[PDB]
Every structure is written in structure tokens, then in C-alpha cells.
């Protein structure tokens, strides 16, 4: 959120003039905000459109941000921690499977409030089960591939 400004002249705005010349159709910035309009936009000052310069060279370093070293790329997660994580996540998956069986049962049974007011404040077994399967499957596939690549490259 950033905006450029220059001030309108009291002299002109009292002596009936628009202190901007509309040669182009570039006056469609964002439909100026109500905050600016009530705080004095279009009366005492005007907004100037803002753009940015792209060099494709600074962008390379900005992309290098978030980058991980090949150490992290090839590292294997602690196998004991991985096994404990799988055990735990499968336990929550078991409980969510019980709750999913319960929910699917009493889902078609009645849908007056099932649309929006049957999950607020209550856990969604289907959603949490999807989250658990996604996370655990990602972890396991990634670690398997890492282990195999390591077994070969570091031979």
C-alpha cells in the first residue's frame, strides 16, 4: 500500500479549475479509497499513479531469497522422528475416521442446517483427514525419494 501525491491549489479550486489535465485515460488508479476521500483527496491534493522498474537482475536475488542449500535439499529427516510422526498422524487419522463415519451417517439424514451451520464450532473429519493424508503422504514420498537418491549418489 503506497501512494504518490501533490497538492491542489486553493486558488484554482476556488477559481473554478481542475488542477489536472485529462489527456489520457490513466485516471483509473483504484477508484480512490473512502479513507483518502474523507481525509482530503481530490480537494486539497491528488494521487499520482505509481509503477515499478523491473531489471530481471535484482529479481534474481529476490528469487534467491527463500532458497535452500543442497545440504537441506538432500538431507534425510531423522528416521526416529519420522516414524514417530507417522505413528501419531495415523492415530489422528484413525480418530478422524471414526468421526467421518459418524458424520457421513448423519449428513444425508438431514440437511436443513448441514449447508452452513453443522460444522461451525465442530471439527470436520473429512477436512482434517484430507489434511493429514496430504501432509503424511508428502513427507513419506519425499523421504523415500531422498533415501533412494542418497543410496545411489553416496555409494
Amino acid at each position: 500500500v503506497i501512494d504518490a501525491f501533490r497538492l491542489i491549489n486553493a486558488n484554482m479550486m476556488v477559481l473554478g479549475h481542475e488542477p489536472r489535465q485529462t489527456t489520457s485515460n490513466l485516471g483509473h488508479l483504484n477508484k480512490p479509497s473512502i479513507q483518502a476521500l474523507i481525509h482530503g483527496l481530490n480537494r486539497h491534493y491528488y494521487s499520482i499513479t505509481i509503477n515499478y522498474r523491473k531489471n530481471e537482475l535484482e529479481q534474481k536475488m529476490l528469487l534467491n531469497l527463500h532458497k535452500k542449500s543442497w545440504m537441506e535439499g538432500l538431507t534425510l529427516q531423522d528416521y526416529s522422528e519420522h516414524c514417530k510422526h507417522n505413528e501419531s498422524v495415523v492415530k489422528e487419522m484413525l480418530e478422524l475416521a471414526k468421526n467421518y463415519n459418524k458424520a457421513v451417517e448423519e449428513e444425508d439424514k438431514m440437511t436443513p442446517e448441514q449447508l452452513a451451520i453443522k460444522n461451525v464450532g465442530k471439527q470436520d473429519p473429512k477436512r482434517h483427514l484430507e489434511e493429514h493424508v496430504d501432509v503424511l503422504m508428502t513427507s513419506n514420498i519425499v523421504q523415500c525419494l531422498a533415501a533412494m537418491l542418497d543410496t545411489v549418489v553416496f555409494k
Binding site: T75, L76, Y79, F154
Partner: peptide, 21 residues
């Protein structure tokens, strides 16, 4: 223990990567 064996192997790999760096 398979966990211990693979943990030792992975620690060897990590030390190897650090040493090549």
C-alpha cells in the same frame, strides 16, 4: 535397529556434505 542404522547412514551423509563444502 533399522532406525539406528539408517540414522547413522544419514549422519554420515550429512557429515560428508559438510566436509565437501
Amino acid at each position: 535397529d533399522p532406525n539406528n542404522l539408517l540414522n547413522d547412514w544419514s549422519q554420515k551423509l550429512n557429515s560428508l556434505m559438510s566436509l565437501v563444502n
